Design a protein around this ligand. Structure first.
Ligand code: APC
Ligand code: HHR
Ligand code: CL
Ligand code: CL
Ligand code: MG
Ligand code: MG
Ligand code: MG
Length: 158
């Protein structure tokens, strides 16, 4: 299955954090990376009172079940110092969010797929479009269409 994972970091050298995360993602059992987006420098959502993010996206081919992939992404976060979860955000070393998992629609205590807010976030959609320009969402909407019918502005490269 192809999982699309959003990567963000705005603490402790985001470029090192993202490169470390890429290496770790490739080492997840029963998985290998297919594609990696460019790296983008984005202002934080909300409280402007924190550093800029590095944002990226990757496509991961995996035979793991969705929650198994989640367990691994959460362990990579922890190994890279990310401890606060489901709280108001302050600067974080790493955030790995599962944007899409195949064409699956998941609404559990642990996992909401497609990511609940991705269609509102250029920092998720533009890196995804760079690696998957022909992508269609589970509800039949095309990614290209979402990005143009609502005039999302372009991002700056890191
Ligand atoms: N698609 C998904 N990817 C990652 N975590 C998800 C997820 N759907 C639900 N979750 C849940 O989200 C919980 C909180 O994760 P956090 O990383 O703290 C949210 P965040 O990434 O800071 O906000 P965001 O989801 O608005 O980007 C996790 O414990 C996980 O169970
Ligand atoms: N620019 C930017 N802001 C964010 N704000 C909150 C969150 C919550 O995870 N993520 C991000 C992000 O990835 N990029
Ligand atoms: Cl943290
Ligand atoms: Cl959808
Ligand atoms: Mg591997
Ligand atoms: Mg997030
Ligand atoms: Mg997260």
């Amino acid at each position: 299955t192809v999982a699309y994972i959003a990567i963000g970091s705005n603490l402790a050298s985001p470029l090192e954090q993202v490169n470390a995360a890429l290496k770790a993602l490739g080492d997840i059992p029963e998985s290998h990376i297919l594609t990696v987006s460019s790296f983008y420098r984005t202002p934080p959502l909300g409280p402007q009172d924190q550093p800029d993010y590095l944002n990226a996206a990757v496509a991961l081919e995996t035979s793991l079940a969705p929650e198994e992939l989640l367990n691994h992404t959460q362990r990579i976060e922890l190994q890279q110092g990310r401890v606060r979860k489901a709280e108001r955000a302050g600067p974080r070393t790493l955030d790995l969010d599962i944007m899409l998992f195949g064409n699956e629609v998941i609404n559990t205590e642990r996992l909401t797929v497609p990511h609940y807010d991705m269609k509102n976030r250029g920092f998720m959609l533009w890196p995804l479009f760079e690696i998957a320009p022909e992508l269609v969402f589970p509800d039949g909407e095309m990614l290209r269409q979402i990005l143009h019918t609502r005039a999302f502005d372009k991002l700056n490269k890191w």
